[PDB]
Amino acid sequence: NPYERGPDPTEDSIEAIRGPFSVATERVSSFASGFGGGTIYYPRETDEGTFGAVAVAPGFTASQGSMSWYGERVASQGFIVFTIDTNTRLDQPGQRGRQLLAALDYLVERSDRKVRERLDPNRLAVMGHSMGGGGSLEATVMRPSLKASIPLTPWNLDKTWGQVQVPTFIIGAELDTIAPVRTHAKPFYESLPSSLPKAYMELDGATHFAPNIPNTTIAKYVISWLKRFVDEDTRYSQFLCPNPTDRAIEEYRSTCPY
Template sequence: MRAGLAGFAGLLAVAGSGYVLVPGAQAAPETAAAPAQPAAAENPYERGPDPTESSVEAPRGHYDVDEDRVSSLSVSGFGGGTIYYPTETGDGTFGAVAVAPGFTATQSSMAWYGERLASQGFVVFTIDTLTTADQPASRGRQLLAALDYLTQRSDVADRIDATRLGVMGHSMGGGGSLEAAKSRPSLQAAIPLTGWNTDKSWPEVQVPTLVVGADGDTIAPVRSHSEPFYESLPSSLDRAYLELNGASHFTPNTSNTTIAKYSISWLKRFIDNDTRYEQFLCPIPRPDRDIEEYRGNCPHS
């Protein structure tokens, strides 16, 4: 009996040392547990600190901004403009956005987007068009020409990730942003602001699109412009419709907290793939004193 107990104790000692005995076989090392898988890599395109309600509504973001004026004589395909860019060089490259004005307007009408968006971590190009009477299809081509210049020839080309680009525009420039998105599906985001276009149907667009309309717009009424633009986009597309409350066709021409908040969130979410900004887009924002209506698909893919 003592011999049996001694043998059993020996077995326990062997097992406790990391060995398992199999009948008819010699003791062998126990298979080591698989190492824990590393956590998923952080999004390499995130820029700036974690956003808050106050940070996306603030007049200025995290980054200091500089600007570079581009003469129409030094470019082709559009009328020149102003590049706004973060001065930070330690955070890697940034996504970029080209912004077009409306009928009879110049880049000065869109200047406020430059510093506001750039300070949140984008390179922004507010452009002049070839003529102030250019129609949406032409403005769409000019937005793309501006992006090509920005990423290939501009003095800040090395600060830009050419795979992360978007377009914005007001009125005919907004119609132009839809034209650009239709022509170049590799874009990451489009934002037509109280857009105007004779083409009301955009099922070909594959670019995540935020359509911004104004309840008091009499030049491009939402019923004949922004609403059909939005409704014609593919239902499978990441899309949203923001109708401003107490606003006019020209509301996007002056600094506006609601436009800034949702534009920044849309660009961050889709140009930077920064899901930290999903909180401002989903669940669907409710109507309030600034928002007449908001539609969209949530959660975003």
């Protein structure tokens, strides 16, 4: 597998705050067409080859600051990470899905050459918090060629996602009162096809804002999910299959094995 990057993982390496790659950033102006700009995090070393990318959307009334900590933590594992702002803070999930796609198109078509020369434009993923998690879902129905989708405590009025054909990893917060897992996260998960590579992880005790705070349980499995499906890196299957059972996890569902 020529998409493999970094040394073989271990239980400890997927929990590391700082991965094997050193990280740099490129700021993207608010004036970009199709989304509210953002920050591109990328691996600095080029000697292992190019990397896939993930665009990351904030939630309703939130800004890219709520999603900042994913930038270095994930990019240092060998990914290009793009934490974006939305056109307005009040944009709905659908718009966020569109804007996630414009952010990835920007990476591919117009980003600085330091980014573009490190990029594999065919290996792309979406991730989002809350309404941005809804956006992550929306994005995959808009662009089925995406490699992965990670909706974080997602929020969406549309509860059926039977048409999704992108490997989807949904993360819920047990006590989430803004996007209750019973009417968002779990209906979304159980609606994805049983034949789709997919997963639900519910964080014990967590509230809606758990994804905005550095969380080793979130990070380790977000990284595994992106490695396994953006890189097709089966070295990371061990952490995804069978169901992880960390003390921090209230519940986990999956269609293992992939």
